């Protein structure tokens, strides 16, 4: 009984991680498209 539940939870846990990994990954790229190379004069500092 406990094992069955553990497995179900594990699957849902691994599934959630994969979803997040894909989300964070997409963001990492969307950020690299801006902070590509060092900023040059004129750019707006944070």
UniProtKB/Swiss-Prot annotation:
Question: Could you tell me in which tissues this protein is expressed?
Answer: Detected in brain (at protein level). Widely expressed.
Chain ranges passing through the membrane: 7-27
Report which superkingdom the organism of origin falls in: Eukaryota
Expression induction or repression: Constitutively expressed in neural cells.
Q: Where in the cell is it found?
A: Membrane; Cytoplasmic vesicle membrane; Melanosome
Q: Which residues lie on this side of the membrane: Cytoplasmic?
A: 28-46
Modifications made to the protein after synthesis: N-glycosylated.
The free-text function statement in the UniProt record for this protein reads:
Essential subunit of the gamma-secretase complex, an endoprotease complex that catalyzes the intramembrane cleavage of integral membrane proteins such as Notch receptors and APP (amyloid-beta precursor protein). The gamma-secretase complex plays a role in Notch and Wnt signaling cascades and regulation of downstream processes via its role in processing key regulatory proteins, and by regulating cytosolic CTNNB1 levels.
User: What does the record note on quaternary structure?
Assistant: Component of the gamma-secretase complex. The functional gamma-secretase complex is composed of at least four polypeptides: a presenilin homodimer (PSEN1 or PSEN2), nicastrin (NCSTN), APH1 (APH1A or APH1B) and PSENEN/PEN2. Binds to proteolytic processed C-terminal fragments C83 and C99 of the amyloid precursor protein (APP). Interacts with PSEN1 and PSEN2.
Q: Which disease is it linked to?
A: Acne inversa, familial, 1: A chronic relapsing inflammatory disease of the hair follicles characterized by recurrent draining sinuses, painful skin abscesses, and disfiguring scars. Manifestations typically appear after puberty.
* Family stated for the protein in its record: Belongs to the nicastrin family.
Name this protein carries in UniProt: Nicastrin
Which organism is the protein's source?
Answer: Homo sapiens
Q: Which gene encodes it?
A: NCSTN
């Amino acid at each position: 009984a406990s094992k069955e539940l553990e497995l179900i939870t594990l699957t849902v846990g691994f599934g959630i991680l994969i979803f997040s990994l894909i989300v964070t990954y997409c963001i990492n790229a969307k950020a690299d498209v801006l902070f590509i190379a060092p900023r040059e004069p004129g750019a707006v500092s944070y």
